[PDB]
Enzyme design. Structure first.
Site, PDB file in Angstrom:
ATOM      1  N   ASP A 144      39.908  47.277 -32.073  1.00  0.00           N
ATOM      2  CA  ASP A 144      40.823  48.384 -32.309  1.00  0.00           C
ATOM      3  C   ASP A 144      42.099  48.085 -31.525  1.00  0.00           C
ATOM      4  O   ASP A 144      42.041  47.543 -30.429  1.00  0.00           O
ATOM      5  CB  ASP A 144      40.193  49.697 -31.836  1.00  0.00           C
ATOM      6  N   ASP A 204      33.128  53.498 -38.047  1.00  0.00           N
ATOM      7  CA  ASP A 204      32.930  53.115 -36.656  1.00  0.00           C
ATOM      8  C   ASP A 204      32.965  54.419 -35.870  1.00  0.00           C
ATOM      9  O   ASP A 204      33.871  55.230 -36.044  1.00  0.00           O
ATOM     10  CB  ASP A 204      34.009  52.119 -36.185  1.00  0.00           C
ATOM     11  N   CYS A 262      11.623  56.641 -40.105  1.00  0.00           N
ATOM     12  CA  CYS A 262      12.310  55.528 -39.448  1.00  0.00           C
ATOM     13  C   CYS A 262      11.433  54.280 -39.270  1.00  0.00           C
ATOM     14  O   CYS A 262      10.248  54.370 -38.943  1.00  0.00           O
ATOM     15  CB  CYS A 262      12.853  55.997 -38.081  1.00  0.00           C
ATOM     16  N   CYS A 291      12.660  51.813 -37.291  1.00  0.00           N
ATOM     17  CA  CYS A 291      13.095  51.274 -36.000  1.00  0.00           C
ATOM     18  C   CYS A 291      11.938  50.887 -35.082  1.00  0.00           C
ATOM     19  O   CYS A 291      10.849  51.476 -35.141  1.00  0.00           O
ATOM     20  CB  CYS A 291      14.025  52.259 -35.273  1.00  0.00           C
ATOM     21  N   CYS A 347      10.504  53.810 -32.971  1.00  0.00           N
ATOM     22  CA  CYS A 347       9.655  54.690 -33.756  1.00  0.00           C
ATOM     23  C   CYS A 347       8.328  54.043 -34.133  1.00  0.00           C
ATOM     24  O   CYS A 347       7.387  54.724 -34.539  1.00  0.00           O
ATOM     25  CB  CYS A 347      10.412  55.144 -35.002  1.00  0.00           C
ATOM     26  N   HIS A 362      17.223  53.652 -31.436  1.00  0.00           N
ATOM     27  CA  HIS A 362      16.822  54.474 -32.575  1.00  0.00           C
ATOM     28  C   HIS A 362      18.015  54.929 -33.404  1.00  0.00           C
ATOM     29  O   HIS A 362      18.087  54.666 -34.605  1.00  0.00           O
ATOM     30  CB  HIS A 362      16.080  55.727 -32.142  1.00  0.00           C
TER      31      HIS A 362
HETATM   32 ZN   LIG Z   1      13.686  55.050 -34.997  1.00  0.00          ZN
END
Ligand SMILES: [Zn+2]
EC number: 2.4.2.29
Length: 376
Positions: free
Chosen positions: A92, A270, A308, A310, A313, A339
């Site tokens: 940026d 973003d 999820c 992830c 998780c 997460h």
């Molecule tokens: Zn997750």
RNA sequence: AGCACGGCUUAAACCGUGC
């Protein structure tokens, strides 16, 4: 191999999914790009960031300039090497610091001269310098130097800032083309300003289109005007911009915001939220936001989100993270953030899948529905 | 300190409300 190659592969309304090809890697779009302001995505090792599905992280100029310093990073082998992320990076210009650190800032025409928010010293960030700094870093996607117009704002500053920002948009381009090392390897994006006034958003678009950029970004929004106003602006703003180039909405990022902006035509996002909220204790799930600090989660053995995929998780309970975050433990900020980012990615994934299946509009409505239900 | 919550769209592992 290609410097910058945006290629849309499907559409549905003002929305579309594509790919951006750069020398450092490929960028799936619509895409969400995690924020690693001071050469690090808070509480996450580069590899974990990649693990979640990010194709590109964003770094900030203003901060890096001050610490560890533009020239120093360059002397060490470029940001990429410095932090350990070999994929594209978008820096940026620092135009956001002009409006958030405005406190210790003094504007002019040459640029924006401000005081180190921690050092107290004085630095003159100009369109020229900003672009030089971004060159030193070795950023793949370079952002023009703008001035994020605060909200509210009278049609006066609304135009002053905007017009001055365009003048700067040109100085950047020139600076960006002055070095062939940068012009042959990186890409340049222009930022549209003009707050909520369209006649102004129009001018900015045109000014930007005249100059010539690899990608156009809508800035100055999500600066506190509510989703309503923002969407209202995106409705006519995104269309003014060159359709065959990517559209990037800066700073926006809230499940419902992103989903809506995509329908409006945005390609890149973003935002600090996922990484900040992780650290704080807020987790993003298909069933709305949840504050893991609540008393309820104390003995909850389910994962942050049962949908999820992830890594968190797949292995830790709400109760465990509840304990950690509440107790000031760092592992907590790590699990939370991992997460939330993985989540935003999965969100970006599902949006993409839907767009190239012509069932995105259906997706969106099913999303807000369950998302606002909050039956979690 | 702690308890019950709330905000965050990088000067926030931070702030704010109540007890
Ligand atoms: Zn997750």
């Amino acid at each position: 191999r290609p410097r910058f190659s945006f290629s849309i592969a499907a559409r549905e309304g003002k929305a579309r999914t594509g790919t951006i090809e750069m020398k450092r890697g490929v960028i799936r779009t619509p895409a969400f790009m995690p924020v690693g302001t001071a050469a690090t995505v808070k509480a996450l090792k580069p590899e974990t960031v990649r693990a979640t599905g990010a194709d590109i992280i964003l770094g900030n100029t203003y901060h890096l300039m001050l610490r560890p310093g533009a020239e120093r990073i360059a002397k060490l082998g470029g940001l990429h090497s410095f932090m350990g992320w070999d994929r594209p990076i978008l820096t940026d210009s620092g135009g956001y610091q002009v409006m958030s650190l405005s406190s210790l800032t003094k504007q002019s025409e040459e640029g924006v001269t401000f005081k180190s928010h921690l050092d107290g010293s004085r630095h003159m960030l100009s369109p020229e310098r900003s672009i030089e700094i971004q060159h030193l870093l070795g950023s793949d996607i370079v952002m023009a130097f703008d001035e994020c117009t605060p909200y509210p704002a009278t049609p006066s500053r609304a135009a002053s800032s905007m017009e001055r920002s365009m003048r700067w948009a040109k100085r950047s381009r020139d600076a960006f083309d002055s070095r062939k090392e940068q012009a042959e390897n990186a890409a340049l994006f222009g930022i549209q300003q003009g707050s909520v006034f369209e006649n102004l958003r129009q001018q900015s678009a045109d000014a930007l289109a005249e100059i010539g950029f690899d990608g156009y970004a809508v800035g100055g929004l999500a600066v506190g005007e509510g989703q309503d106003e923002m969407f209202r602006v995106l409705d006519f703003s995104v269309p003014m911009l060159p359709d065959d180039k990517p559209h990037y909405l800066m700073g926006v990022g809230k499940p419902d915001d992103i989903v809506g902006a995509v329908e409006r035509g945005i390609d890149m996002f973003d935002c600090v939220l996922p990484t900040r909220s992780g650290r704080n204790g807020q987790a993003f799930t298909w069933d709305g936001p949840i504050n893991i600090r609540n008393a309820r989660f104390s003995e909850d053995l389910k994962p942050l989100d049962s949908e999820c995929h992830c890594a968190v998780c797949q292995k830790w309970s709400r109760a465990y993270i509840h304990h950690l975050i509440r107790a000031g433990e760092i592992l907590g900020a790590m699990l939370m953030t991992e997460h939330n980012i993985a989540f935003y990615q999965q969100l970006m994934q599902k949006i993409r899948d839907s767009i190239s299946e012509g069932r995105f509009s259906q997706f969106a409505q099913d999303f807000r529905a369950r998302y606002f239900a909050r039956n979690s």
